[PDB]
Design a protein around this ligand. Structure first.
Ligand code: HEM
Ligand code: TPF
Length: 529
């Protein structure tokens, strides 16, 4: 009974492996992990304390390509094959998707000890925004940061923001090359050019104030563009690569936060701290409950993240509203009549209160946010093994969970004829959102305890959006003026473009052009320029 010879031949075999030709070795260096990956998956399917895992050929890469380009189609296919809970490999990570309202609850309402947002996002956000805020801090700090920000987002603030936002829109109609309404009565625009510009101008003016708005008229504006490039999904895997893209980003964050700190210190020196904007508010109101004060650097960094986030969600959304209305002159017509009745033929000046009496306008935003959730996927890193209720499934620590309310937004089960733009599905239901029951406070105010609504444009739970009322205010003023001022339509043969899912926000694939026309050719916008 000699197996000793077999053991000798193991060693010999190893020895002959090392002396294979470099061509053969390389081949095996490709072959063996390829093979091994496939046997591992088939073995994984045998487990039943794990959700089904989408099969994939290329190791590490996983389903990144199909998920990257068409996430909702990927989700529908996996849903038919596996049901609502399923996993897939994504550039080194395992993602567990839980679709539908039950998925909303499972992730948005997950215990603080179970999952972590900042563990998923810090590598992306922190380089762009700066240190010490949002995801570069414990959740408890984020909770209070949101409370600080919310303090400049009150109804009284909105009343003062509306005339400011209105001024910026009219100034843009007057002075932008894309319009020049005093010189031209019709023209073609790329909505992906005009809306990011209109969004930053209106949000800067209202949230940051006149000084910071004034800066955007100069070469300074280029830094925001640079900083914008740091906010892409590439940084989700490659956050720091010694290339120019990453230096301009880093330089921008320093440069922009430098500018904000400069204003903060100037105001404090001159005792010029009032109730004008978000800067005044954070200067007066940014002490944590343990007594630690946010630094001027942290305040500036928080300003960047808040403005940047709201920039991309809002610009994408106003772009979609215009693009959907471009093929619906019936809806423009209906929106226009509401403007005439509420504002008395346009003789009343637009106020925040009058905005609230424009349900069809507000429903149009609501419906656009249904068909185009700006964030198609939201992530959490799983910090300890989670048991999926009413299943035998366990999501181990190290996995990521992925929730997608935008997907449910497009399901016929919850929204009949979901792929049809219909603002009237929200008749007598024009609120941006609301809790249909019990509430809870995570540190930034009472919000809905349940997150099982099939409509969740602003998420839910501790990470829930706090910019929703600002977004409706901004989008409301913007669309109210667009409607009263212009009609618009598609170039012949053009229709609503498909989403570009490959960016951080699900903006339309551009260029996406519409043709505008003045409702009143002779109308003039006053002021100097
Ligand atoms: C159409 C407009 C917007 C939509 C649809 C939207 C959507 C969302 C969603 C879904 C989340 C939750 C993310 C998650 O659960 O992982 C969120 C969080 C947040 N958003 Fe918004 N947002 C919008 C505009 C804004 C604006 C205008 C601001 C600021 C002025 C803003 C600031 C924030 C903040 C501070 C959070 C908290 C992030 C966290 O706690 O993890 N958003 N938003
Ligand atoms: O939630 C975001 C970050 N994010 C998550 N997936 C993709 N981007 C986006 N966002 C949501 N509303 C507005 N922006 C965010 C949250 C807070 C924030 F300050 C910035 C920021 F980008």
């Amino acid at each position: 009974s000699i197996v000793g010879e077999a053991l000798e031949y193991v060693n010999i075999g190893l020895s002959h492996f090392l002396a294979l030709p470099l061509a053969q070795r390389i081949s095996l260096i490709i072959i063996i992990p390829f093979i091994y990956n496939i046997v591992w998956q088939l073995l994984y399917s045998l487990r039943k304390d794990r959700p089904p895992l989408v099969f994939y050929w290329i190791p590490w890469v996983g389903s990144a390509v199909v998920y990257g380009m068409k996430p909702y189609e990927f989700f529908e296919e996996c849903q038919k094959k596996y049901g609502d809970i399923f996993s897939f490999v994504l550039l080194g990570r395992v993602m567990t998707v839980y679709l539908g309202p039950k998925g909303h609850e499972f992730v948005f309402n997950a215990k603080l000890a179970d999952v972590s947002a900042e563990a998923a996002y810090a590598h992306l956000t922190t380089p762009v925004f700066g240190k010490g805020v949002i995801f570069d801090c414990p959740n408890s700090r984020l909770m209070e940061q949101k409370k600080f920000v919310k303090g400049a987002l009150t109804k009284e603030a909105f009343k003062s923001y509306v005339p400011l936002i209105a001024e910026e829109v009219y100034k843009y109609f007057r002075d932008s090359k894309n319009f020049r309404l005093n010189e031209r009565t019709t023209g073609t625009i790329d909505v992906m050019v005009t809306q990011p510009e209109m969004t930053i101008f209106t949000a800067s003016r209202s949230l940051l104030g006149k000084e910071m708005r004034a800066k955007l008229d100069t070469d300074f504006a280029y830094l925001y563009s640079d900083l914008d490039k740091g906010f892409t999904p590439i940084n989700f895997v490659f956050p720091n690569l010694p290339l120019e893209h990453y230096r301009k980003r880093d330089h921008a964050q320093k440069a922009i936060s430098g500018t904000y700190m400069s204003l903060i210190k100037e105001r404090r020196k001159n005792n010029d701290i009032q109730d004008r904007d978000l800067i005044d508010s954070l200067m007066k109101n940014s002490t944590y409950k343990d007594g630690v004060k946010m630094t001027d650097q942290e305040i500036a960094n928080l300003l960047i993240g808040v403005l940047m986030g709201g920039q991309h969600t809002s610009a994408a959304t106003s772009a979609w509203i215009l693009l959907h209305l471009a093929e619906r002159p019936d809806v423009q017509q209906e929106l226009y009549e509401e403007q005439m009745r509420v504002l008395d033929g346009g003789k009343k000046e637009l106020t925040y209160d009058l905005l609230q009496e424009m349900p069809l306008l507000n429903q149009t935003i609501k419906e656009t946010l249904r068909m185009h959730h700006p964030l198609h996927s939201l992530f959490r890193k799983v910090m300890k093994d989670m048991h999926v209720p009413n299943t035998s499934y366990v999501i181990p620590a190290g996995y990521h969970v992925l929730v997608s309310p935008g997907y449910t937004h497009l399901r016929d089960e919850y929204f009949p004829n979901a792929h049809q733009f219909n603002i009237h599905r929200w008749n007598n239901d024009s609120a941006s959102s609301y809790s249909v029951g019990e509430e809870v406070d995570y540190g930034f105010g009472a919000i809905s305890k349940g997150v099982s609504s099939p409509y969740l444009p602003f998420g839910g739970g501790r990470h829930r959006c706090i910019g929703e009322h600002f977004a409706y205010c901004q989008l409301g003023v913007l669309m109210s003026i667009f409607i009263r001022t212009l009609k618009w339509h598609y170039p012949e043969g053009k229709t609503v473009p498909p989403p570009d899912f490959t960016s951080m926000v699900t903006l339309p694939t551009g260029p996406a052009k519409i043709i505008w026309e003045k409702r009143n050719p002779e109308q003039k916008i006053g002021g100097r320029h």
